[PDB]
Design a protein around this ligand. Structure first.
Ligand code: J7R
Ligand code: J7R
Lengths: 301, 306
């Protein structure tokens, strides 16, 4: 028992972290097989960032203009290309520590583990959720670009995020590993306000099921609601509307606990309307929305 | 910016995790050089657990009763011994992925990362604190015994915890890597109770400094308090007494923020008495006590590891 914010073991990703330097600009890269992936803004100077022409900036660089270092050892570049917002550097050798991997584009509300790196060396590993406004509330400092987010399934690493920037509100924005940004953000130094965020309804429901599994059941009530009646309450408290696909994804947790999803929604409605009255759920005084149903299943059997 | 419950990179420890099977029992072992360390209760049947005599039960086993697998490679056991509550199995082959390591016994309130493993496979990593009652509030299922907790200094892994059991109240208990339990617990299926816990004060102060570093300042005030006056309020709300040593280790965070420790203590005193008035600190409606001053510095300055 117990329920913790748990990241995947980072070893398989650590073996892929390199340093990428173009001019004086240096950030982290992801070395998989014979390709190194990193944010394309490594080819920009600070003044370039205000209004970059990435296609022009790329021709004025060359294979020799890229300095890739794997553990203080330099790698040699044999090719350069740009796919959306990621730079791809073909190198001399396939990484011998390349894990079984895929590139995936996650949906908002899905979670993943981030390996925060600086100069190609890891600082820490933590769990994040792709927020409905396509930011993530990460922990990143200057030099962290190129750090990646990932999930690990039975020995295959699914890379889903590469870090590009911190917005003025302190949240983070990035691309998938094909270089397409999550959300409407762009790799330019310009006003880009993230839209207002919302609470991930299905994740909050997943976490309440985790609480019931761990013995917290004071919030269960005898009432029920419909999907439409619940969604009227959700919009009032800035919760994502609940869909039938979300109900189905909670099916495993509803079956293990015997609590129907729309019954749990009735419990959630009361929690939104009345608060918690000085109680906690899984040690939290607030409703937690960065655990997916699959995150709950993994820890809660 | 941002502040997360952040674990160490686990790769170095992942390379040491093996599976240990004795009879119908399988749990995790830690393979360092040519030795595998694991909970000694792997030699017990369920009936043995009610009142085991480990010295007798170990005399009754042999090298061949132990099946050790590192991934898909079987390792052959050439010796078995017991050091307190840990079993030590000498194997023919040294782990080529053995990192620089030490075995340390941590103090209550200190933090570490747990690499949750099952059948020798790492499943997840998270940060936890050694609670003042010498339990940890972990996330563990059946088969997790032998999972280890650790810290990393540059390239050296300091192992400090090996998981042995879940108490009936749902918290977790274990040993250092010399086999000595943290707390008054024993590896026996018998009535056992953890003592009453307290809040780790120096960690709450560290976390408040992390909040200021991240721009949360609404809880700051113009007052300062004395050590004694604070401790009078702290002990009344089940907080650990604040010591001069705790003030000194908070020094870097105090200097980086320009907020004196006893100045922050005035904020903590008001927070303990009055709550947050519907506000949050680093996204939490409660005071967090599982970040040490060193954890805060490591995360907010970008300390890295091999
Ligand atoms: C801060 N400002 C922006 O992050 C930013 C904002 C916008 Br709008 C657009 C871009 N853009 O287009 O690349 C940005 N990235 C910067 C531009 C050049 C390359 C990388 C730069 N950022 C980091 O190094 C960085 C990453 N993570 C957390 C941080 C925390 C503190 C300081 C810096 C970071
Ligand atoms: C649950 N019960 C106890 O864990 C327990 C309780 C007491 Br009282 C004493 C011991 N003791 O003496 O070892 C215990 N360990 C068990 C006995 C034999 C060896 C390993 C056993 N535990 C696990 O497999 C385990 C570990 N962590 C979380 C779990 C969650 C659910 C189920 C099992 C676990």
């Amino acid at each position: 028992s117990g329920f913790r914010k748990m990241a995947f073991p980072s070893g398989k990703v650590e073996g892929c972290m390199v340093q990428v330097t173009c001019g004086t600009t240096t950030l982290n890269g992801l070395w998989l097989d014979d390709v190194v992936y990193c944010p394309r803004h490594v080819i920009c100077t600070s003044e370039d960032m205000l209004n970059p022409n990435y296609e022009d900036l790329l021709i004025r660089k060359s294979n020799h203009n890229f300095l890739v270092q794997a553990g203080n050892v330099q790698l040699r570049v044999i090719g350069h290309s740009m796919q959306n917002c990621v730079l791809k550097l073909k190198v001399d050798t396939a990484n011998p520590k390349t894990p079984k991997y895929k590139f995936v584009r996650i949906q908002p509300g899905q979670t993943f583990s981030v390996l925060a790196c600086y100069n190609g060396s890891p600082s820490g590993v933590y769990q994040c959720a792709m927020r409905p406004n396509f930011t993530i509330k990460g922990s990143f400092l200057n030099g962290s670009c190129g750090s990646v987010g990932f999930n690990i399934d039975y020995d295959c690493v699914s890379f889903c995020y590469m870090h590009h920037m911190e917005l003025p509100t302190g949240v983070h924005a990035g691309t998938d590993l094909e270089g397409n940004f999550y959300g409407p953000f762009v790799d330019r130094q310009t006003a880009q306000a993230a839209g207002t965020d919302t609470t991930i309804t299905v994740n909050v429901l997943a976490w309440l099921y985790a609480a019931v599994i761990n013995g917290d059941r004071w919030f269960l009530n005898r009432f029920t609601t419909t999907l439409n009646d619940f969604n009227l309450v959700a919009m009032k408290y800035n919760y994502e509307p609940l869909t039938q696909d979300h109900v189905d994804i909670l099916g495993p947790l509803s079956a293990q606990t015997g609590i129907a999803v729309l019954d749990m929604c009735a419990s959630l409605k009361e929690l939104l309307q009345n608060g918690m009255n000085g109680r906690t759920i899984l040690g939290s005084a607030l409703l937690e929305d960065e655990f997916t149903p699959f995150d709950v299943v993994r820890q809660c059997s």
